[PDB]
Structures are given as C-alpha cells and as structure tokens.
Amino acid sequence: MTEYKLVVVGAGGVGKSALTIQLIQNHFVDEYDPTIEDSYRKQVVIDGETCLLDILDTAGQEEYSAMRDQYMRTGEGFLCVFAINNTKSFEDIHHYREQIKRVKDSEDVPMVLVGNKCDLPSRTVDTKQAQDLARSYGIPFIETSAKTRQGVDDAFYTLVREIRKHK
Amino acid sequence: SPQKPIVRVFLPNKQRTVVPARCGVTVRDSLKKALMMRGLIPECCAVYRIQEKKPIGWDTDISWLTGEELHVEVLENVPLTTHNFVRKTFFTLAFCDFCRKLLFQGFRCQTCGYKFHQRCSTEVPLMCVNRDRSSSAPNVHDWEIPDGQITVGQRIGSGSFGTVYKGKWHGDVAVKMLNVTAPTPQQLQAFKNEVGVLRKTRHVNILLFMGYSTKPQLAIVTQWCEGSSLYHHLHIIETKFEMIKLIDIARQTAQGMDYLHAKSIIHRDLKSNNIFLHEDLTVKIGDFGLATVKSRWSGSHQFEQLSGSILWMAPEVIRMQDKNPYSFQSDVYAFGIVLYELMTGQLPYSNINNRDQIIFMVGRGYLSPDLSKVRSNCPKAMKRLMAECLKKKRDERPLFPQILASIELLARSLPKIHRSASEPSLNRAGF
Amino acid sequence: DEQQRKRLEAFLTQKQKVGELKDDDFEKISELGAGNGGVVFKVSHKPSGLVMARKLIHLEIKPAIRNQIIRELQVLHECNSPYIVGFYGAFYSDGEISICMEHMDGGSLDQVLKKAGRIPEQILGKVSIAVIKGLTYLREKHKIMHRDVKPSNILVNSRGEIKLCDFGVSGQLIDAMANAFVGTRSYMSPERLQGTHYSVQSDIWSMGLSLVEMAVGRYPIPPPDAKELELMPMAIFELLDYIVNEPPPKLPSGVFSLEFQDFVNKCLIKNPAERADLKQLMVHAFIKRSDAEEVDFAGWLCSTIGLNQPS
Amino acid sequence: DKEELVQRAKLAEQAERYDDMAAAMKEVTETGVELSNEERNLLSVAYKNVVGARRSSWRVISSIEQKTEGSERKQQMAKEYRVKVEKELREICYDVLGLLDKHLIPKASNPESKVFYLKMKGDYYRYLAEVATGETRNSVVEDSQKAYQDAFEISKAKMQPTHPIRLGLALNFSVFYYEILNSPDKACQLAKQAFDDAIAELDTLNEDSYKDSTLIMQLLRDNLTLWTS
Amino acid sequence: DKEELVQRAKLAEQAERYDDMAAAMKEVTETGVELSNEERNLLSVAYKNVVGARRSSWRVISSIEQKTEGSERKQQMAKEYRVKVEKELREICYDVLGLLDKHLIPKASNPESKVFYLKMKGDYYRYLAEVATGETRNSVVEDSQKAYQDAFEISKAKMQPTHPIRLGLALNFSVFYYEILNSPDKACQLAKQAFDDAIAELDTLNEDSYKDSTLIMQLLRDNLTLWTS
Ligand SMILES: Nc1nc2c(ncn2[C@@H]2O[C@H](COP(=O)(O)OP(=O)(O)NP(=O)(O)O)[C@@H](O)[C@H]2O)c(=O)[nH]1
Ligand SMILES: Nc1ncnc2c1ncn2[C@@H]1O[C@H](COP(=O)(O)OP(=O)(O)OP(O)(O)=S)[C@@H](O)[C@H]1O
Ligand SMILES: Nc1ncnc2c1ncn2[C@@H]1O[C@H](COP(=O)(O)OP(=O)(O)OP(O)(O)=S)[C@@H](O)[C@H]1O
Ligand SMILES: O=C(NOCCO)c1ccc2cncn2c1Nc1ccc(I)cc1F
Ligand SMILES: [Mg+2]
Ligand SMILES: [Mg+2]
Ligand SMILES: [Zn+2]
Ligand SMILES: [Zn+2]
C-alpha cells in the first residue's frame, strides 16, 4: 500500500549493489561489476505494513553522475554508503549529502549512513569516526556486511522508517 | 552519448540496467546476469528495441545497438522444460549430480539426465535445462641422465617453458630444454623432488617420464610420440571423426587425468597441444606437473607468473589473485575446454581478435565458451557435462572420478539414443 | 623532406635487387632479440649481399590460414614511409613464418630504455613526433591501425630514424595471435579490454603508456610508490583490472615540464573520444616545442648504446 | 477389490518391479471394468517400460553383433541370443495387442480414449516392425499406417491441436515415418505443421496441462533441430 | 566349452539383462571348474545386481508401508507384497550360497580368491540379515560375523593396505557393524584405522587399480564423516 523510493549512493566499490542484491535475493555477489544504472522492486513487510520498495542503485563512478542524479531526483530517501576500508569513500559522504541537497533542493531529506564491508580484516575507518559523522548530520549509522548479510535489512528498514517519520 | 557505447535496458517490474555495448557479445549474454538476478532467463523472455517496440533476436550483436534503449518482457510462453523424473535404481556406477556421492537408488530426469538422491530433491535445478542406509562396496569393473648418451636430433618446437627436440636414448625420446637454464640450488632441489614423483607414474594414458639430465642445462626426457597431437588433428587438418571415436578420446583423456589426480598431481597444462593420439588409437597426456620449472624463481619462492595458452586457463587461474590457482578444478576446466574443442572442432572464442581482451574478459567472469556452436545431435546429458566443467566458480566443477563416470555412462547409451525421440512416460512423480 | 626522400628511394633501389626469398639464401649472422611468439635474427641475403632482420614466428595453424596470412602480409610492400620499418618480403618454410625487414642497428626502444635507465623528455618529444607521424601514415594511406604500440615495436637506427613496426596488417595473423601465451604486462587501452578497437584513439593510449614507461624507466601500472618516485609482482589480470577500474597513470610532479605532462594526460584519458586524436596531438604545445628543438638523436643513441659518435 | 489391485499396481510401480505391475494391470483390464484416466495411464507406463527395457537390450545386442565381422564363430551364438531376445520380445507385444483386441477398443465411450488406444496399438506395431524383416515388416507396418490414420482424424476433429495426446500421436507418427518408411521430408513437414498449429493455439491450456504438452513440444523442437542438419 | 558360456554371460551383461547372465554364470559354476580373475567379477556383478534390484524394491515398499499409517487392506496387501519380495530375495541369496559353498570356497587355491569369496559370503549373509527379523536373525548375523572375521584375518596377514579387496572388506565390515550390530564406536575405530593404513602406502598405486582404490577411499571418508556427526 505503501511504496517507498530508496536510492543507494556512495563511492565506487563500497558495496551498494552487493547490499541491494542481498536485500532482493539473499545472495552475495563477489564479482565487481560497476553499476551504470539498476533499479529493483521488492515487496517486504516492515513494522506490520506491506511495503513496495523501489530500490534505485546508482553508479559510484562519477562519469555516470548524470544518470545518478536522475535517480536521486525521484528518490524519497537515501542510503549513503561508504566502505570501512576506504577513508576517501567515508570523507566523500559529505559530497554525496551535498549532491542530495542539490538535486532535492532541500536540506530535509531522509538519509541513513551505512558503513559496509565490516567482515574484512584490518578495518581502517573506526566506529567512533563513523558515529561522529552520522551524528553531525543527525542521521542513523548502520554497520553492514553484504557478504555475511549482517545489517542489510536494518539498513534498508531504517531508511523506510526515516521516510515514514518525514512523511 | 555512447558513454562507453552502452545500451540502456528496461526490465520487468519497472526495473532497469545498463550494459556495455561491446562488439562480439550477444544481447542474451549481455543481459544474462541482470536477468538471473531477477530469476529470469532469456528463453522465458522477449527483447525489443525502441524505434515503437520492435522485436529483436536474442543472438543479435549488442554493439549494433549502442545508444539505444531495449526492453525485456515475458509473454509467459514455453516454460523451458519441466523435469521428467523417473525413480531408477542404478546397477552401474552412478553419482548424484548435486552431492557427488554414490547413487545406488534415486531419480533420473529422462530428458536432461540429471541424477539425485531422494534426500537431495530440494537441491535439484528448477528448470530442466536440456537414518538412511550407509553405502557399501560397489561392483568391480638419482634419476639424472649423464652426458654422452642423449643424441639430440632435429629441433621440433618451442613451448611455454622449453624447446622440444627428438633425441635418441635407448630408442626415440623427446628431450626438452627447459627455459630455466640457471636454477638456484633450491629450485634444482625442488625440481629433483618433483621428478621423484613424476618418475613413479605408469598409466596407459600418461606419457612415460624417463627422468632428466643436469649436465647440459635442464632437459626433461619423455617418451617420444609418433603420429600427431590432438590439436594437430583438430585444427590443422580438421579431420573430424565419428562421435564414437570422439567420446572414446574424451574417455581416455578423462581416465588419464583421473589417474593423475589419484596421485595428487595437478597437470597445470592440459590442452589439445599436450594430448597425443599414439598410433591413432591410444590417448597419451604429456607435459604434466613440473610446477617448479615454470615461473622462474628468484629465491626460495615460486610465485607463478602464469604461462600457457589462456584458452585453457580457468578463471581462477587467470586471476592469479589466489595463492595457488592450479588445483584439481582448474584441471577440470582445462578438460572442459578440451571437450569443447573436440565437440565443436573450433577453438573457444573464435570471434575475438585480441589476446589481452580474452584474458581480461575470462578472468572477469564476463566471457564464457559459447554453447550455441555445438552439433545438432549431441545428447543433452553429454552437453550438460561440458557445461558443468566450465563453471566460473571452481567449487561447482566436478572432479575427474565423476567426469569419467558420466562420460562412460553415456558412452554405452550413445547408439540407442541417436535415433529419434519418442512418447515419454507422463509425470509419475511428486514431492 | 629531401633526405627522407633520398633514403626512401635508396631503400626501394636496394629492394629491387632482392627477388624470390628462399630459406637457403640466408646465412644467420646474429640473434637480435626474442619475445613470446617470435625470434628475430640479423642475417645476410647472399644473392643480394644485403643485411636484414628476419623475424620467425612459429604458429601451429592450418595451412589455409597460414597461406592467407602469407598473402595478407604482402601488403607491407606498399608501406613506404620514413616512420615505418622497411619490408623486403615474407614467406613460409620449415614450419615457421619468416618476415624480412630492414635492420635497425640501434634496436627497439625497450632495449635502449634498458640501456639508458630513463629517456630524456627532449628525446621523447622526437619519439612522439615519429610515432604520431607513423600512426597518421597507417591511418590515412592504408586505413589500417597499429593495435600493438609499445616500446618493443618502436625501432631506431644510427641515422636518427624512428620507425614503427609489428602493426596489425593481417587480420588472420591477429586471429592466430589470439591463441598466444599470457604475457607479463599489457599496453592495451581500456576500451579494447572490454570492447573493440576505437580507431587510432585506441593506439594513442598505448603511446602514452609507452612514453611514461620510457619517461620513468619503469612499467607505470601500478604507479610508483611514494618513496620509489623520490628515488629518481602484480598479476596480469590485476594489471588489466587496474587499467579498466582505476585512474590512469601520470608523470611525476616536477621532473617534467607541464606541456609534456599535459600531453601524456591527454594521451591517457580513459574515455577514447575525450582522449585526443592524431590531429590534436600534432598541434600540441609539447609537440610544437619538441619539433622546434634541434635535438641530436643519433649521437645520443650511439652514446647510450656505447658506440662511438656517428657522422 | 479393484482399488486393492490398483494400489498393488502403484506399489509395484514405486518398487521398480515392472513385470508384477504388468500382470496386475492385465488382470485388471481382463475383467472389463470402466477404465478411467489414471487406471489406463498405469497400464501405459507399465507396458511401455517392460517393452522398452528389452528394446534397449536388443539394440545393444545388435550393435555388439556388428562390431567386428572378420572373426570366428563368436557372432554365431550372438545372433542366436538375439533371436532368443526376440522370442521374449514379440510375444509380450502380442499379449498387449490381444488385450487391446479384447476389452479396450470395444469398451470405449470417449473418442479421446479411442485415440489413445489406437496410438498404443500403432506404437506396439512400430515396436514389432523394427525386429521383423522381409515381408513381415510390410505386414506389420500396414497395420500401423491405418492405426495412426484412424486416430489423426479424431484428434483433429474432437481435440485441440495443443492437447498432449494429439501431440504425442503426431510425435509417434513422425518417428514412424522417419525410422520405418524413411521419408524424412514428410516427417519434417508433419512435425512443422503440428508445431505451428500448437503455437497458433496456445495459452489456453489448463493449469495441470502446463508440463506434459511443453515436454512433447520441446521434444518436437529437438527432433526438428536434429533433422534440419 | 567354457568360453562360449563366458561370452554369452558378458553379452547379457552388456545388454542390461541380469536374469540370463545370472543363469549363465550359475551354469558355469555348476561345471565345478575354478574360475580365473576375470570370470569372478562377472559372477559378483550379476549376483550383486540381481539382489540389488530386490533390495531397492524392498526399501521403497517398506517406506510406503511406514508412510501409509492407516487402517485398511492396503497395509495388509503391502505386507503380502513385502513378504513375496522377501521370499524371492531369500531364494536368490540361498541359490548364491548353495553355488558358493560347494564349488568355490572349498576349492580356492589363491588366498586372494579366498578373501574375495569370504567377502561375498559375508555380504550375502548381511543381505539376509537386514530383511529377516526375528529368531533367525541371530544365526545369519553370527554367520556373517564369522565369515568377516575369517576374511579379516587373511586380509591382515597376506594383503596390501591399498589393495581393492582389503579396502572393500573393511568397508563392508564397517557397514555391517554400523547397520546390523549398531555399534558405531567400533565401526568408526575400524574405519579410521583402515583409512590411515591405506594412507600409509599411498605411493604404491599401480595402474591396475587406482580408480577402485581412490573410490573406496572416498566412500570410507564419506561414511566416516556421516558417522562422526
Ligand atoms: N567483503 C565484502 N565485499 C563487499 C561488500 N560489499 C560489496 N563488496 C564487494 O565490493 C565490490 C564492489 O561492490 P558493488 O556493490 O559493485 O559496489 P558499488 O558501490 O555498487 N560500486 P559502483 O558505485 O561502481 O556502482 C564487489 O567486488 C563486491 O563483491 C561487503 O560487505 N563485504
Ligand atoms: N612427448 C612428445 N613426443 C613427441 N612430440 C612431442 C612431445 N612433446 C612435444 N612434442 C612436440 O613438440 C611440439 C612443440 O613443442 P612443445 O613445447 O611440446 O609445445 P607445447 O606443448 O605447446 O608446449 P607446452 O609447454 O606443453 S604449453 C609439438 O607440436 C609436438 O609435436
Ligand atoms: N627489425 C628489427 N630489428 C632488430 N631487432 C628487432 C627487430 N624487430 C624486433 N627486434 C627485436 O625483437 C624484440 C621485439 O620484437 P618482438 O619480440 O616481436 O616484440 P615483443 O618483445 O615480443 O613484444 P610484443 O610484440 O608486443 S609480444 C626486441 O628484442 C627487438 O630488439
Ligand atoms: O609481429 C607480430 N606479433 O609479434 C609476434 C609475437 O611475438 C604481428 C602481430 C599482428 C600482425 C598482423 N599483421 C602482421 N602482424 C604481426 N607481424 C608483423 C607485422 C608488421 C611488421 I613491419 C612485422 C611483423 F612481424
Ligand atoms: Mg553499484
Ligand atoms: Mg615486437
Ligand atoms: Zn531434466
Ligand atoms: Zn544426493
């Protein structure tokens, strides 16, 4: 009854597509097939409501940012993904938030910060850094691993809950 | 514009994807993965270009469509094929295609030949792509040659780790001047240890390893083969043989590889160049093992720099990212490419004019041996084996004990199944 | 010009003196180099007394394909340019394809680069000029593309000439070459690793990837370390993945002028259309400057190899 | 009583013992009870498998017989063993044909079942035509021609072209043309006609009839692809 | 002549018929001449497949009997069919044992042949053990135990740790321990000891038996993994 338009954004390689495919099909993709554009639909019960999720999975490669911006303009809420082994992807969360503000013409857009690849050894973006960044924007932070599925549902369901709050 | 000549594809249920518009790739293959992620298969769908919706063939070269928008829909037509499962007891050696364990009693798909235990019905492929009793006993059916002895004769040809000459040593032998001319005292020791294993192999389908010689550099001494190699008989003269002899060649190659793997020897080089037809009858595999003479060392390490025709290298071997990529399953992939070469008579990727392109696309999991060039009479059971050998993920590939058995199973049912099909038994199944 | 016309006419004159090329007409003098697929020797043609280079490629291909390759290789008799290595005749014998070309006593730029450690920007300018002019000659006069541009195929002699060779004139020979052993490094442009030749643009990347390699004396993928740069074993699939999914390499900060760095960055664009074409590079600032410079290439080459000064 | 024998037949089918199922179905049809769908399908499967195993055995025996002709009198006993196999092959087909002459054909109140039984008669006559040579081959095939020609009409007039029984009849008739009469062009034309008619009238089947008809059509596509080359 | 009978038996084996093959090999054994190495495998395969078909039938029939879970005549008829197939299997096993203990076991010059025949005797006594439930079970169980102990003594004395016969005997003995006697601790102990001893002489693997050796090795590993859970 209720449709939610979710956009997954962030730097190349952070795991946007692997997270999305774990949500949709419960399968981990180990290949790295860079996205140009990919959209998905998934029906899911969240907090007792049967939800139709439109997942708009965008390119991390800035060469395709024009396509990303078209997806962002239709979206209602944004998963902003970085990888816990890529400090530039973490720093560039600010870039993605600014892009969202620009395309949505609004500073009041549902957003969730996702730190992905937490199954890896030798993690370099620590929990305190990540929680401070989420705090600085007043948004939730969810740790995920698309490989183990840890946090995947929590990330998307939290974004749906943020959109509901905003509605 | 072309932006890496891409094609935009609209998919069922308001979805979408972008694919590279690369010369030489079908629409089907460009879209295979996107469809699979959505539980679709090209054969259950139609594709159209926008021009307003005009149907295009799945085997279209996608590069003609750069800049265009395609749409994929379904029409719910033929559901591929449903598994016609008949309960069968196997009086001969059979293995469950899921669990690879012995299958005394179970189910057989009449159409596609898939075999599985009663306990594995939850693991059967959905589409027919054309407290239990413990098992029991099944049916029963210094090696250095010194100088002054090897009469090095005429130069035959250079390879990927050495040059082969026809030498005289108590009869005709094949001498091989290994490219590694200055081995360290550790590489020499490892090579001697490897030869220690290689000298203890004696099989009808394995070329005899008669040691080596250290005084005139390094020189593998193997049994000289008369006649010609399989590559010579398949791509030089193109003398195709009847399916019976082809399956027999595949069976003897699989038997030789099974003997090699029973002793834990990775071939690392199985290809149509190293398969000989001794007196046009006996299959003899050569140039096996010798991992220490390939990828010249810099010390006590043997980082495999990778060398060999990439047409037979498994994707895990192409990547080389793994610590050791030459496992049994890479040997199985090499055998599968040999099967493809035998079955179609053409080398894999006969539409690509670049070598580095093949390496990248194969190692990337983008390019696969096209299975649309096969003959129009090959039983589906046999073709399924070939498609199982070429699985990108190496863990899915079967081992040679299973491949030899599967080949032999259809070796006996070949003549009877060549006739036209017939009215099959109905469903007679239920789960 | 006048000297180039003189040399081309003299090469044609010396070429008419050679008739049918038989294997018995050659006496092997020396080996010149070897690769993963062929071996080249310096030899003397007894019937005409000339001294040439003979590349021997050993392919296991069907006789029809071999004969079509031999026939296609005869187009090289039309390539007559001061930036293209001279061709005397190709033939097949003893199971090997033999290609006869003029002897470049200076060798290939890979050997010169190994002998020199690094190559000066000023030399590289003339090198780039020659490479661009050869690519222009191949694209315009014959509508064929090199496809294999790298330092191993750029040849130089004691007379200061810089000529291209080992270009893809026989499509069937390339098709046979697709069944080759895996090399240790690639110069293939990123589009060719995912698609097909995007005209001469796909060559230009290689030239850039060559120049940087000659500019620093090191294969530039992956780019040098932070302290390896101040000092002024990746898998092949990893190299290709870096070529496709990573930013292209670039020259060091301050060791080279800005025109050369801009030239190489325009030559190494990951988008082939955004990457510069032959006409763009021909009128580049670095190209104009290196064309204005009066650099003594022959003497520098002889010095680097260790031979006494020529002329 | 009848249900007890049908349960015995099902249990024998699950046990892979087929001769007991053949006997338990022949004794059931011997009475002359109203034969429903499942009851006749069990008979069809039983009498298919029992003859199919022996036909595969005969094909293997004949293939071994012609492996090497330049040899001693080892083939002498091979052809006599094959003759014994035929002696245990023709008579069961005669037990099936006599059964079809006893109850099935007269006790038929539905054209679909009549087509099914006539197709079975034609199939067992085609089964006998392979081993039988000389004028016996002709005498056998002359019966199968009319058995299929008295069934195709009823299939066309009473049942849709997408019906699985009609598709099976067309498949068997094409195989009869190809293997026995050796008219591959007519067989290909018949198969193409049947497949085009099936495609022209599709997406009207029942929910259950979404596996068997697809199976027959995919076998038809396989045969068409095999016979094109 | 013996060669004609052996060729007929092999021809029937290639035809997937295991009734003429068993009769032909029974007639061969009735002559009372000692078999060669090749001729014994055909007998073993024939009298393994014949029993195996009944074993599969018995397994599926008992599964249906344990599945129905009702109160009707279906269960009674299923019990009658089970006792029928059990009587047939008993007849087959008794014919095998009568043909074994009168012409082969008392006249076996080769100790390897003695181990093979005692392994077969234990196998068929185990086949009879798993079906016969009651007082007669304790007789055949102890007979199989004695046969297997006699075979195992000779296997430990004069056999190779990598020979197919010794590995097969060990595998059948561990399965006998696990299924009949239900003592998995000693079965696991025996399996681990046998697998280690076969691991010992891994280099000594000639071409004569590499497939059988590694196949029995993998089957032992699978059973070990199944039993250690
Ligand atoms: N170990 C691990 N790898 C992951 C995880 N998520 C993604 N990856 C890997 O990281 C690579 C990039 O993933 P992908 O989802 O394509 O990233 P993306 O953010 O969508 N990239 P783009 O912006 O180009 O579309 C893939 O190889 C994928 O398997 C994770 O949680 N753990
Ligand atoms: N044991 C052998 N007996 C006879 N001829 C042989 C033997 N081994 C190789 N040759 C010949 O050697 C020729 C080329 O030498 P090889 O190095 O064996 O080629 P190659 O097999 O491609 O090299 P690798 O290392 O196996 S990839 C082949 O065409 C064969 O005719
Ligand atoms: N005309 C020539 N005159 C002199 N030496 C030559 C000539 N052509 C090639 N060479 C030598 O041969 C080597 C280059 O030729 P190739 O081996 O064919 O190329 P490559 O090194 O294999 O790299 P490729 O062609 O991209 S696989 C160098 O060692 C050169 O010195
Ligand atoms: O030489 C080649 N590849 O390198 C060998 C691998 O070691 C090569 C590759 C492709 C090609 C297409 N048409 C000719 N082709 C080649 N030959 C060649 C071409 C021009 C010249 I001047 C001299 C030559 F030898
Ligand atoms: Mg992505
Ligand atoms: Mg070269
Ligand atoms: Zn199937
Ligand atoms: Zn299983």
Numbering used by the authors:
A (entry chain F): 1 to 167
B (entry chain A): 151 to 201, 204 to 282, 360 to 370, 449 to 738
C (entry chain B): 43 to 274, 307 to 385
D (entry chain D), E (entry chain C): 2 to 230
Which lines from the publication concern this structure?
We also imaged a similar sample that was subjected to cross-linking with Bis(sulfosuccinimidyl)suberate (BS3) prior to size-exclusion chromatography. The RAS-front conformation is not induced by cross-linking, as we also observed this conformation with the three-dimensional classification of particles in the non-cross-linked sample. Overall, the resolution of the cross-linked RAS-front reconstruction is ~3.9 Å, but as in the non-cross-linked structure, the resolution in the region of the KRAS/RBD is considerably lower. In this conformation, KRAS binds the RBD in the general manner expected, but there is approximately an 11° difference in their relative orientation. We identified two crosslinks just N-terminal to the RBD domain that are consistent with the RAS-front conformation.
Here we describe cryo-EM structures of a KRAS bound to intact BRAF in an autoinhibited state with MEK1 and a 14-3-3 dimer. Analysis of this KRAS/BRAF/MEK1/14-3-3 complex reveals KRAS bound to the RAS-binding domain of BRAF, captured in two orientations. Core autoinhibitory interactions in the complex are unperturbed by binding of KRAS and in vitro activation studies confirm that KRAS binding is insufficient to activate BRAF, absent membrane recruitment.
